[PDB]
Each structure stands twice: as C-alpha cells, then as structure tokens.
C-alpha cells in the first residue's frame, strides 16, 4: 500500500492502471483535504488550513463536491464546455454527492522503475456556478509526461462568490480556496515527489479565467511559476462580476432576508441551509455573470484590463489559446436543418449581441458590415460561419490576444496556440469546428484510452497522435516553461516559437500543424483597436 506523510498526517493512496499497455500505472490520492471545511462560521470567509490527524487517512475515493445545481438551474449553455452540455447525465453522476464541506484536491503521481517532478494543478470552471476537478482524470497526463497532476475543488456560485462590495462579504472565497490549495501544494507536494518551484496552474473556460485572475493577484506570489489558460481570460464579459451587491441583494430577497444593512444581509445568508441558496435562480445580464470573481481591492486589486494594461502583474511563463469554433452554442439553435442562417435572424443576433455587450447604431452597423461576406451575402451557410465567428472572436479570440499582447509586452515568456481539430460526435452538427471545451480530452490524453463515459467520442488514430503532441507541449512547458524543451516531437521545423507583439507567432494545432502569424488579425484589430474608437 502506497502511503505518504504530510504536515497534517499520513494518507493512503490507490493504484490505477490505464486501458493502455504502454503507460505505467499511477498512484492517485483522492479527496485529500487541503483546507478546513468552510462551514458555519467560516462560510463567506477565507479558507483555513486543514486540521491534522494522528491516523492513517484513506484517500481512495472522491469527497463530495461543492454544492451546485445543474438540472433545474439555468445552465448558461454558451459559457459551458460543449462536452459538458451534451451529456449532463454522465456529468450529474460526478456531482450526485454534494456537501458544503467540499475543499478537497486529487493527486495523480506517476510510477518509476530521480528528481522532484513538475506539478500541474488543474482549475476547472464552466460559469463559476458548477463543476468539479473530479471530472478530469489526471492519470494519463501524469503517466505520459511524468508530472504530478492535481485537480482541485473550490467553493462555487453563491458560497464561493457572494459579495456585498463591502467588508460584510468581500467575495472571492473560491479564489482564496485556490490560493490555499496552492499553499498546501507548495508545502506538501515534496512528500509526493513534486517540485514546489515548478508548479504550473492550468484551466479551460472559467478555469482559464481563474488562471489569469490568479496571475494578477499578489496572493499567488511564489506559489506557482507558470500558467496555461485555455479558452479563458480575465478580460471577457463573463470573467468578473461588476455588480455583486445587486445580486447579493436579489438573492437575499429571494430567500427571505432583511436586505437593509449589508451585515444583516450576510448574517441572514450565513445561517441558511446551503440548498436554499443553491436552488435559487438569479439571472444576470445575457453574457455576464452574477456570482463570480469580484474586484475587491485585495485578491483582485482592480479591473483586470487596467492592471494588465499597466503591467501590474508579475513574471510568469504563459501559454494561452483558443479553439476554431468556440461559440458553437451561440448559433447551434438558430440554424435550420439546412445548416444555414437567415439574413433576418442574423440582424437580430448581431443587434441583440451588440445591445447586451455595448448598449444604446454606428457600432451595430459597423459590426454587421464587418461580419458580412460581400461576395455571396445570400449564402446562408456563410451567414452561420461569420455569425459564429463574431461570438468566438468577441468572447474568446480578442481577449486572448489582448492578454498575450500584454504579458509578452511586459516580459513574460508567452506561447499562443489556435486549436483547429476535434473528434466529432453525433451530439454535434457535422459542420461544426472545434467548439468550446474540445481541447480538453486531448490535453487529458483521453484518446490514449479510447472513449470513456464522459468523452464518448470514437477517437481516431490521429486523435491519439494529436493528444501525444499536445501533452508533450503542455508537459514540456510544465518542465521548462518552453513547450519545446525536453521531450521532442517524434515536427522538424515545427517548433512552437515564442509569441510577441511584433509577429504574434502562434501554433496552429491540428492534423497539419504549422506556426502562423497574427491570428485573425483583421477581426482582432477590429475589436481591439477600432471598436474602442466608436464609444462614448
């Protein structure tokens, strides 16, 4: 039996062998508490260190996840990864078991047959409302790349992000949870053979957002050294909550609280059964979030755009990227069995879109103009392409570029990719490119095993190769802060060149891998340079 001693006690893992006879099994420590339960008086408070035990602790099963509601809730289909939206039956099973006491992480440690390994800590996130690290099996990544992989569970939704804009409830509890998790990791991962000076934090979607947010925070100073944000930034409309007080108030009201003083407000919620808080439906503006990270003058000292613009963040090795057709769900339901979009629905889509994002006609006109193919403007297939590209460009591509531009500008080694391949399911239209969340199975090395309940795609032979390529890039980055060094690609002249504002080189990731320049330079500059000139 595999046992490790931590600063809090002894824990017993479990062995696990993969459905692939080329990969050496791993030992996984599941449900390791990295913090005291955030219950009762510690609700809406920063996390505290875990209590120690004079015992051999069993870390062989997942602990209950943080309270959430994915069925009768709202479920922001545009924000969520497609693989998650498409089978929430299998997702539900990961989340059937919930508890407020939910601050646990999972360790995946490889198996040799010399030297502290890199640690890759995965932060999940759909919309800040739901999810678990448990949905992500770190086994293959750990075994293939010889790195320790940790997946974390942090407070979600109300319990993780309630804020009054005051000292009553300051918010960002879920972010502090991630900091605490990284503290525990930094000072306890050596016992597992991990390297506290080579921790790489990584995440997709709102997970990416967390990653970026953490790099703006002076709390993560000395806790991790590199970051990978996948289809996620701190600059998207749904990255932070700009009106937390308003929604705290609405939530308080909905569960029968005196919304008078903010202290009496929190005190009221402090005491309610979590289910009351979770089962409540608080709808924010279209492409915005109600309960999420907040500008608190502390963890997040100011608007990420300002901080980033001013270089008020430390040096990290950064890797970020986007998928080809991130915004599948924005268009999916507006299509018409002929795989096309009417010139009518288009105007609506774009008009509504600009309304929600920008407000109260030159901009609406400019965007309609910019996203119309004047060669065959009657092609209704083209209309869905450019409509999908509009959402992908706005919500993902332009913020990623801005992020890459600003990190690299201020000296941080930056690598940028664009993901251009996926495994198509029957759950997705055949005309769809790589949707949101589609990089994940490759990164998790799922093709190395073949279809699982979670990712049930029939991974081809090329999917396995791609995954190995991706995993080599990611683990190389984790090892050296360079996706090229150690393990080479056996990609001759195909070396992931570092991104900078001059040529803006990025890696086209697909069955025909290439390194190009200025990804979608026209639209990116539209949104990043020209669209600002049309404001008041």
């Amino acid at each position: 039996d595999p046992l490790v001693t931590t600063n809090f006690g002894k824990i017993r893992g479990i062995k696990k062998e993969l459905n692939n006879e080329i990969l050496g099994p791993v030992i996984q420590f599941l449900g390791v508490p990295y913090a005291a339960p955030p219950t009762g008086e510690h609700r809406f408070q920063p996390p505290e260190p875990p209590s120690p035990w004079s015992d051999i602790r069993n870390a062989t099963q997942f602990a209950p996840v943080c309270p959430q509601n994915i069925i009768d809730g709202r479920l922001p289909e545009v924000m969520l990864p497609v693989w998650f939206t498409n089978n929430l039956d299998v997702v539900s099973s990961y989340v059937q078991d919930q508890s407020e006491d939910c601050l646990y992480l999972n360790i995946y440690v490889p198996t040799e047959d010399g030297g502290p390994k890199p640690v890759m800590v995965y932060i999940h996130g759909g919309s800040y409302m739901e999810g678990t690290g448990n949905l992500y099996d770190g086994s293959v990544l750990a075994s293939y790349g010889n790195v320790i992989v940790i997946t974390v569970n942090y407070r979600l939704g109300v319990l993780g992000f309630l804020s009054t804009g005051d000292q009553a409830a300051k918010g960002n509890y879920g972010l502090l949870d991630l900091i605490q998790a990284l503290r525990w990791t930094s000072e306890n991962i050596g016992f597992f053979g991990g390297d506290p000076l080579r921790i790489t934090v990584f995440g997709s979607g709102a997970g990416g957002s967390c990653v970026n947010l953490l790099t703006l925070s002076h709390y993560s100073e000395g806790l991790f050294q590199r970051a990978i944000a996948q289809s996620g930034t701190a600059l998207s409309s749904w990255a932070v909550s700009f009106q937390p007080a308003k929604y705290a108030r609405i939530l308080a009201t909905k569960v029968g609280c005196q919304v008078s003083d903010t202290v009496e407000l929190v005190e009221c919620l402090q005491k309610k059964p979590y289910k009351e808080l979770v089962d409540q439906d608080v709808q924010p503006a279209r492409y915005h979030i109600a309960f999420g990270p907040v500008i608190d003058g502390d963890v997040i000292p100011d608007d990420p755009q300002i901080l980033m613009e001013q270089g008020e963040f430390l040096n990290y090795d950064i890797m970020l990227g986007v998928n080809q057709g991130e915004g599948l769900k924005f268009v999916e339901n507006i299509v018409d069995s002929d795989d096309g979009v009417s010139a009518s629905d288009f105007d609506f889509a774009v008009s509504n879109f600009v309304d929600n994002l920008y407000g109260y006609d030159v901009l609406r006109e400019t965007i309609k103009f910019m996203y119309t193919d004047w060669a065959d403007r009657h092609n209704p297939e083209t209309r869905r392409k450019t409509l999908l590209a509009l959402f992908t460009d706005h919500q993902w591509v332009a913020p990623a570029v801005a992020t890459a531009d600003l990190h690299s500008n201020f000296g941080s080694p930056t690598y940028f990719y664009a993901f251009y391949h996926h495994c198509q399911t029957d759950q997705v239209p055949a005309w769809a490119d790589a949707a949101h969340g589609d990089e994940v199975p490759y990164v998790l090395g799922i093709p190395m095993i073949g279809p699982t309940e979670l990712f049930p795609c029939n991974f081809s032979k090329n999917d396995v190769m791609l995954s190995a390529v991706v995993m080599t890039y990611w683990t190389n980055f984790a090892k050296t802060g360079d996706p090229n060094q150690p393990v080479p690609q056996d990609f001759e002249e195909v070396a992931w060149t570092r991104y900078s504002q001059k040529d803006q080189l990025y890696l086209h990731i697909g069955l025909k891998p290439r390194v190009k320049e200025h990804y979608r330079a026209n639209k990116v500059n539209l949104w990043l340079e020209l669209v600002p000139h049309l404001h008041n």
Binding site: E221, G311, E312, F313, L314, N315, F410, G411, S412, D482
Partner: protein, 187 residues
C-alpha cells in the same frame, strides 16, 4: 540564511583606474518582476561622481533602478512605469574613503534610503503610483556604460535575496567580470 538587515559584505572587489564592471544577467526566460525591492551595498570610495549599480528592465521597457554618487552624496533614482523618482542622502557625504553600507528600499511608489545608521530618508508619494518593477534583465555593477565608472571597493551587494558579489567570487555562470576589477581575497 541571508538577511537584508544584516551587513551585506566581506568578495571585496577593487574598482581601480580605467574602470571596471561586474554584471549579473537573468536568463531571458526568468527575468523577475517585483512589487518590492531591497538593495544593500557595502562600499568605500573618495570619488565625487560615480554610478555604483543599475538594475535595468528588458528591452522596450523603461523600468530601472540606479544607485549612484553625485557631489559626494549617495542617492537613488528609479522608474516603475509612471516617471523617474529620486531620493538622495544630502544631510551629509559618503566619499570620505571609509566603509559604508547604503540601503535602498522600494515598496511600489514608496522608497527608502539610509547610509549607515543615519536618519532613514523617506520618499512617500502624494498619490498612488505603479507598484511593479517589470522583468529585471541585468544588474550592472560599475557604472562604466554610463560614463561614470566607480573607483574604490565593494565588499557585498545584496539584491532581493541575491548576494551578487559573492556569486561572482563563486564563478557563477551568470556573472561576467570585465575591466579593472580584482577579487582581493584574504591574508
């Protein structure tokens, strides 16, 4: 087991006529940015004008830290984004040929300079300033490239945990000694 408050010396480098320069260089993939800086340097000289150390940011960035002597008075001048900030010990003089330890300290816009046990000079801002020194590229001990080479001795140079001169006497892969600079040992 270093401390900013503990004496930074005792690696005694002589910077004689013709000028000298010791330079530490961070790998382009690990140039540090810092919200706070602590410099402590032990030295001795008689010069009226010299530039002892200067920390410079990567290319295309204006962040830097410069420790220098001007009219026999030690001082510092730095920039973290906004504009140049200056702080100097004018109460007295330090080019009397004896050993001194000048400490400089930065916290965002806040700054500190002390010459030995003399009154800590404080330079507070009347408004919030930028707080970060972006990607530090090189430490340039000597002030030769600035056309004011330093002449005298330096027993130690502590910079944010780094014992710069000690690392040079350990032939550290990052240290580059160039010019009229001798590592006077002992006995």
């Amino acid at each position: 087991h270093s401390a900013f408050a503990a004496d930074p010396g005792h690696t005694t480098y002589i910077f004689s006529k013709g000028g000298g320069q010791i330079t530490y260089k961070w790998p382009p993939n690990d140039r540090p940015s810092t919200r706070a800086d602590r410099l402590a340097i032990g030295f001795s000289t008689v010069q009226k004008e010299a530039v002892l150390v200067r920390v410079d940011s990567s290319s295309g960035l204006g962040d830097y830290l410069e420790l220098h002597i001007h009219q026999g008075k030690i001082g510092v001048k730095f920039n973290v984004g906004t504009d140049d900030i200056a702080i100097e010990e004018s109460n007295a003089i330090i080019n009397d040929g004896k050993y001194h330890v000048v400490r400089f300290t930065r916290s965002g816009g806040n700054a500190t300079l002390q010459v030995d046990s003399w009154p800590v000079i404080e330079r507070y801002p009347a408004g919030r300033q930028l707080t970060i020194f972006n990607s530090q590229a090189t430490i340039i001990i000597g002030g030769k490239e600035q056309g004011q080479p330093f002449q005298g001795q330096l027993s130690g140079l502590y910079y944010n945990g780094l014992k710069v001169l000690n690392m040079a006497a350990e032939n550290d892969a990052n240290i580059a000694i160039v010019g009229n600079v001798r590592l006077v040992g002992e006995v």
